[PDB]
Design a protein around this ligand. Structure first.
Ligand SMILES: [Mn+2]
Ligand SMILES: [Zn+2]
Length: 446
């Protein structure tokens, strides 16, 4: 089917007017568009991409940490077992650390060697060469990266790291790599393997250049098919490194979007869109997440939040904490989105009331503990689930005032009658009830 190789949703900007035009915002967040390629974005805004060149990065912070992935240099769009016999889903991707200065030396010498090879003139496949990919470089420190982060404020508001319409701005604290910028340094063949974004939040990626990247994209509502493929091939969809066999996908009638990202092109990945990427030339990229205020985004975030619990994987976004912040601080005028949030809050409230009464009925004391504001959400020190309001802390951690948090289930498993724990409460019930009761649908004529 030609429908199995659909065209790329793609917008071509010439100037600042095009970039700030509101129908662009609406196109990107439309659930029918799994990905949007915004071509010419840097040129239209006169963004200085030179602030992210390797030369500039070395000067700025030469000892900065870089995560290295050591990989095989594979042909075109394929992934072969090391022997070169058959195409398989499993990637080879070994981890180590280096610095910006050291990776930079390698990136440059890699290009010089390729020039010389090009001038040396002239098991079904392979054997394959080894390459290194510098990934997940942390650009959160505004003191170390002042000029770099300022340049990204030139973007239209919907695409910024920080904005009033961004759910990740309303979380109220830092989530590393999501509401902070990540940087990637590349040589040809550098691969970011198959994945969905953390808790299915949208993402922004800009190619710094000078070389191109090639992207592969599958819509959110086929993610289940790719999950089945991973399990059949003995891989964890959420945690393993895998690179889809395009012939397998075609056979299973899964459509695949495929396109080239040139320097200055911005790629918008919509919520839950499955994707994997490879460098075609020598380049750097920057990326972060954004959470549009839509029913579709909130729904997919909640779904992945609950799926992660079943798979014993931590959620970087604390969706209970976020939901309360939305009710406290945000006027919601879409009836669909409003009903979703109200439903979730009522479920949180009922569970909390049920647990609290059980504790009281058993004669366990609930200790008023309160809360520092802008204090981050808490997670269980053993199982890493989000823990809200009622915190379970050992007698000794309480005494030492280290307040090491446990969920109810993990505390019970340790201490059958909770005799080794105290129960801390960060919010009064009457106050949460008020927030819930006062959270009402706002009128908007839009
Ligand atoms: Mn991604
Ligand atoms: Zn736990």
């Amino acid at each position: 089917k030609d429908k199995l190789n659909p065209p790329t949703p793609s917008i071509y900007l010439e100037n600042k007017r095009d970039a700030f035009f509101p129908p662009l915002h609406q196109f990107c967040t439309n659930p029918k568009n799994p990905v949007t390629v915004i071509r010419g974005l840097a040129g239209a805004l006169k963004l200085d991409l030179g602030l992210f060149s390797t030369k500039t990065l070395v000067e700025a912070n030469n000892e900065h940490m870089v995560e290295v992935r050591t990989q095989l240099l594979q042909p075109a769009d394929e992934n072969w077992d090391p022997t070169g016999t058959k195409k398989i889903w499993r990637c080879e991707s070994n981890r180590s650390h280096t610095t910006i200065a050291k990776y930079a030396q390698y990136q440059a010498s890699s290009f010089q060697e390729s020039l010389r090879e090009e001038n040396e003139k002239r098991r079904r496949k392979g054997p394959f060469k080894t390459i290194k990919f510098g990934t997940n470089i942390d650009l959160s420190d505004n003191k170390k990266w002042k000029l770099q982060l300022h340049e990204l404020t030139k973007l239209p508001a919907f695409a910024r790291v920080v904005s009033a319409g961004n759910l990740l701005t309303h979380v109220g604290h830092t989530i590393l790599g999501m509401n902070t910028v990540q940087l990637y340094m590349k040589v040809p063949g550098s691969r970011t393997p198959g994945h969905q974004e953390n808790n299915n939040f949208c993402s922004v990626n800009i190619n710094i250049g000078p070389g191109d990247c090639e992207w592969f994209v599958v819509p959110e509502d086929y993610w289940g098919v790719l999950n089945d493929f991973c399990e059949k091939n003995n891989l964890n969809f959420l945690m393993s490194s895998w690179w889809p066999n395009l012939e397998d996908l075609y056979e299973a009638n899964v459509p695949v979007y495929r396109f080239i990202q040139r320097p200055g092109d911005l790629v918008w990945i919509n919520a839950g869109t499955v994707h994997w990427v490879q460098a075609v030339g020598w380049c750097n990229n920057i990326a972060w997440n954004v959470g549009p205020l839509t029913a579709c985004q909130y729904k997919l975030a909640v779904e992945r939040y609950e799926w992660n619990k079943l798979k014993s994987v931590k959620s970087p976004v604390p969706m209970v904490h976020l939901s309360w912040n939305m009710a406290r601080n945000i006027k919601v005028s879409d009836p669909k989105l409003f009903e979703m949030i109200k439903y979730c809050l009522l479920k949180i409230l009922k569970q909390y009331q049920t647990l609290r009464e059980a504790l009281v009925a058993a004669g366990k004391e609930v200790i008023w503990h309160g809360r520092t504001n802008d204090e981050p959400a808490h997670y269980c020190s053993i199982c890493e689930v989000e823990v809200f309001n009622l915190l379970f802390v050992t007698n000794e951690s309480n005494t030492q005032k280290t307040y090491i948090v446990h969920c109810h289930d993990c505390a019970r498993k340790t201490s059958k009658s909770l005799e080794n724990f105290v129960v801390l409460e960060q919010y009064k019930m009457e106050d949460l009830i008020q927030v819930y009761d006062q959270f009402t649908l706002a009128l908007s004529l839009s």
